[PDB]
Design a protein around this nucleic acid. Sequence first.
RNA 1: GGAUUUUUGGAGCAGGGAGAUGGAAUAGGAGCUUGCUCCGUCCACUCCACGCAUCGACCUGGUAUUGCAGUACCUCCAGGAACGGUGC
Lengths: 90, 166, 71, 62, 74, 162, 82, 83, 79
Amino acid sequence: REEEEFNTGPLSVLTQSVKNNTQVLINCRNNKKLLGRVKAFDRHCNMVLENVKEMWTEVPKKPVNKDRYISKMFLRGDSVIVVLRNPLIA
Amino acid sequence: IRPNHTIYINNMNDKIKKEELKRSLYALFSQFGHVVDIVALKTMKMRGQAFVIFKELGSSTNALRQLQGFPFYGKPMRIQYAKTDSDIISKMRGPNYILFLNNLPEETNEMMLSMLFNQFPGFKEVRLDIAFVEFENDGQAGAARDALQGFKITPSHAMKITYAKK
Amino acid sequence: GKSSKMLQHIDYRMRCILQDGRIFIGTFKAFDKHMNLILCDCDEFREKRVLGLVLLRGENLVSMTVEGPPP
Amino acid sequence: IPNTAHFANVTQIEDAVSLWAKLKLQKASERWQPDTEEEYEDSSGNVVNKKTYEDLKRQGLL
Amino acid sequence: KAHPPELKKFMDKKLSLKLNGGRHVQGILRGFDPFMNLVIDECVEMATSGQQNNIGMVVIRGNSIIMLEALERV
Amino acid sequence: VKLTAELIEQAAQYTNAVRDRELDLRGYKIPVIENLGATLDQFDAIDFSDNEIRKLDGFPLLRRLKTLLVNNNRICRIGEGLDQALPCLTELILTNNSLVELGDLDPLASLKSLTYLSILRNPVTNKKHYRLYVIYKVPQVRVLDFQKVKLKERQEAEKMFK
Amino acid sequence: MKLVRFLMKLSHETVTIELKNGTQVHGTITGVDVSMNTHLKAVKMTLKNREPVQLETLSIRGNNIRYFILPDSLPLDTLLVD
Amino acid sequence: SIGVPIKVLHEAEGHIVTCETNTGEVYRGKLIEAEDNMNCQMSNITVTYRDGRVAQLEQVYIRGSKIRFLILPDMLKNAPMLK
Amino acid sequence: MVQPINLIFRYLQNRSRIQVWLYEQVNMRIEGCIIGFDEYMNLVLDDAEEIHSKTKSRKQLGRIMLKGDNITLLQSVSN
RNA sequence: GGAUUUUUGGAGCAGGGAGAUGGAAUAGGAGCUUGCUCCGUCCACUCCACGCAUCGACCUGGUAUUGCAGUACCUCCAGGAACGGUGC
């Protein structure tokens, strides 16, 4: 019931990220896009990823864009707004 | 009016704020003792009046005697004793050794004499228009004899306390 | 397991930060499953505001830390 | 509360304190306390006032 | 669990409800709901300029309900 | 009976009438106010009434200290580093002290946040033009000896000794 | 499957937590509950356009935490086995 | 099933308290009805908001969804709230 | 006592045009004919139109599946 | 045990326009220092649309109340508006 819904619904789009070890992008509510490989997921979209690259844009408070890299991180499913899977690892 | 731990001051300036007047009353009452509570309202019934309830009745009596008619924010406030007991005090509550008393009221019971002698610390026993009060300490008996010499209790008559002889 | 994270700070003065930027420093007496904090004789800093016994909801809580010794 | 034969087979706290209050009242009642129990007639009037306790007599004779 | 709100005393009474975004409506309640949904028959909403616009029978959800003040003595 | 950490840790601390955290340190007869680092600036008011403190100095950095009760003491001198140790000191009750000269009020001008000051029952208040000198030296104080400072008193303080 | 059992087994590790308001708190994770109640000891918190402050203890809720940051030497492959 | 702050709020019904909402509205008065979901229904209530628009109403009802905090008197903080 | 679910069922049976206001958004609302509903207040509007009160414009979209978490107020219109 | 009152968030972002107005001590680029010119970041004043209206706290003057209570807040008039939030 739960496994078939996870392997046949939208969560299968997450399950293709951890099985085939592909890179996907996650756009959050803080105007930040983190591209990385999804290592661990759950039913509440708790994404524990490794080797992530997060890019955004900031103002001095003209503005300018910036980016950074993290070895391993974990983000909750509440702040995850958009999740895009694209063949970028090849 | 019987002395109590709460002293009420009236005829004050009602143009100041409530919190500033309460802080000024607390700073004025802190010099005489620890202020437990300060009741101050600004309504039409309680305008220009406040009260301070302290832990000890002697500090409240000294604050009422020393600050009697003191100028407070341009207006001389009049301090007096409270008519009823405070709610915080009711919640928290629930030379020689022998002193000779003369011209005592016959209608006063032993509980009123115990409440009058409770300004001094714990005594041995009390004897009952003449009365004999014996204290366990010599300095406490001397302070009770110096304090009750002309006290304001039952103002139709005057109570006199003197040291007993041998 | 032990669930002694909230019981160790019982009857102690703690300062909780709100979501809008307010700070309530009060004596934490009890809690619940919804993180409802009861701060007896609490002060509001952002200026000092006399509040007293303030029962703040758990939805507006962000972080909490120890302020000082228990009275 | 002292350990005596009265407080035997009593295992609860409030029962012990209540029985201690009872025993205290009983014993304190049944003693002879001369301070409050005595009839002195001071020589102030010397023919009246026999209601003087043992303390008021010292205050009058001081 | 799932206790309904105490809205039996405010039945068929003209009350003013406040909704999120600074919205104000006034009308008579015609029922209750466990999800705090209120049906206001012949409701009138206050605009930004101050004019009242009659919207008729409307349904207000509990997710945006701020405060309901009863204008009649119950 | 000097002020130590064990005396401050065993002292009572509660809420005052103004809903502020006050520690009751009365009845200790401390000759010098020191070892106040054990409180860790967790008290909004300090009740040091009925003591034997001679100089109001030696206090550490306490940003939460807003009220200081020094009534019924023998304070005759004020420390010059009072602003560096108490930037938020607004209430100072120095009634019935040993201040005789107005020159002891000169380190009290560094407290910019001080608004309520009490200098009653002191020989320095009996001197000529003491209130005008206290208004001229400390313009940030709004209430002096339970009296609101008016514009005429400020003009009289700014006119003389200018 | 459940991320709460993986987050509860990450005790005695120096991690960081970034909230939704931009405040980042870095400290040693000492207590994790089922509701993600992060109780840390000797933490350092830096808010948005503010100075970092060090605290002996801190208690952050699960709903207020936006992102987490783990060290690179964390055994994520061994801790994932239930 | 009932929390201790919920029981303290239910036991404080009938006293002069206040409830500050998430938007800043402070409904003050006698708590007539206090449910388990922080539903505060008061009679002869007074609105003192963070906007400052102080008014008096016959009856008010504030739900627990937008309720930020509640200011209660200290008459029930001694017993039986001592645990 | 009139239930809101019964009123929504009567509005779906009558097939009248209703306007739905969004939560924390007073500039733009939706308007359409509700065909069906569910337990999560999910509305299915046929030939729906988004009306912007600031720009005084109306953009039609057609079949729209509006969630119940965003709709704050719903009123009945004669158009 | 992610679908309206608590914990998988409805949050993010920007402060109206103009003027040969004024400043970046040590911190912009280009015309490849210094002087000058141009352009995507603030504060102070002035003008239009003191951004607008509201109530609360607050300051000056005049004025009323002398009253024994456990408190959102407490007299009224006029001027000024340093502060808070609400809707456009």
